[PDB]
Amino acid sequence: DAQSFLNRVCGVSAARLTPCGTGTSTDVVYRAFDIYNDKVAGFAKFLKTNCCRFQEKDEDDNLIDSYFVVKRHTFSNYQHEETIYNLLKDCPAVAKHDFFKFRIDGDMVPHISRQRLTKYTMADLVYALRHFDEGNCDTLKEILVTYNCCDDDYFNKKDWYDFVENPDILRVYANLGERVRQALLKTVQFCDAMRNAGIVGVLTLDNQDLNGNWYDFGDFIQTTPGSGVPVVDSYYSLLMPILTLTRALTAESHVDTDLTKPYIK
Ligand SMILES: Nc1ncnc2c1ncn2[C@@H]1O[C@H](COP(=O)(O)OP(=O)(O)O)[C@@H](O)[C@H]1O
Ligand SMILES: [Mg+2]
Numbered sequence: 414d415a416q417s418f419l420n421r422v423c424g425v426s427a428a429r430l431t432p433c434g435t436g437t438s439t440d441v442v443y444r445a446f447d448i449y450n451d452k453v454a455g456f457a458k459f460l461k462t463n464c465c466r467f468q469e470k471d472e473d474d475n476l477i478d479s480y481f482v483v484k485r486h487t488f489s490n491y492q493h494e495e496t497i498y499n500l501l502k503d504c505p506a507v508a509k510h511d512f513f514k515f516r517i518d519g520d521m522v523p524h525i526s527r528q529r530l531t532k533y534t535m536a537d538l539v540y541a542l543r544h545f546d547e548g549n550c551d552t553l554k555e556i557l558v559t560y561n562c563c564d565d566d567y568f569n570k571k572d573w574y575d576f577v578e579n580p581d582i583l584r585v586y587a588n589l590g591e592r593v594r595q596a597l598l599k600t601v602q603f604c605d606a607m608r609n610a611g612i613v614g615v616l617t618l619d620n621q622d623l624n625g626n627w628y629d630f631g632d633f634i635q636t637t638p639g640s641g642v643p644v645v646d647s648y649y650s651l652l653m654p655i656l657t658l659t660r661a662l663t664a665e666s667h668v669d670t671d672l673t674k675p676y677i678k
Pocket of ligand 2 (some may be wrong): 619620629
């Protein structure tokens with residue numbers, strides 16, 4: 414049932430969810446995968462249709478930027494990703510998973526539910542800032558608004574994007590800095606949690622939500638503990654220009670690397 418499924422998704426973690434889907438059905442969304450496999454390669458916008466998404470609403474029943482993605486896939490992937498998560502559970506930079514098999518039509522379909530992810534992923538931010546198109550940029554306005562970078566009336570300005578006719582735009586982009594820097598830090602934690610847990614895999618941007626949590630272990634093969642290896646060639650390099658467009662390291666010139674402390678002399 415469309416309500417029993419939602420109540421199961423809520424699970425132990427007490428939350429109130431509004432289904433962005435339609436009656437326990439997959440929600441088709443247009444994202445910015447950074448993909449490479451036998452057939453397709455590149456950093457493009459694909460159309461993902463294997464994730465039933467619910468949005469959490471806090472007290473006052475206001476929708477907030479925290480979702481419950483419920484990706485459903487085959488049983489072998491279910492087992493493999495459950496074991497990989499169990500190995501990587503203890504890290505703080507890993508979105509809290511919840512694995513459960515549910516009655517849908519005629520068989521127990523296994524759903525793995527990522528809890529409290531942001532709407533977009535770091536790949537979406539990188540793509541929006543790297544493939545800018547002034548006439549069609551709705552996934553950049555939404556990111557800039559939902560994280561209080563600007564006021565949603567900044568976009569009524571005639572040139573809210575020009576770097577030469579509106580230098581103040583930089584001050585807006587810099588308001589993402591402390592949201593990017595943290596992400597970087599969390600990667601260095603997640604990478605460590607792999608190196609210690611002996612897991613070999615490729616870190617792609619489209620798996621890290623804007624908070625920083627990493628939530629996909631589909632192609633993570635495991636090896637002898639303590640001898641894992643994260644591959645971050647295509648993560649730090651695609652994310653590279655955003656570290657100076659949004660001045661991500663500007664918090665390193667404050668004593669104790671705190672944005673409230675005074676400057677280092
Ligand atoms: N055709 C497919 N149908 C359903 N699931 C797939 C398919 N191809 C790959 N997958 C699984 O989905 C993962 C990629 O999905 P993705 O869009 O990244 O969701 P997530 O970001 O939650 O991992 C792969 O690691 C694999 O386990
Ligand atoms: Mg993924």
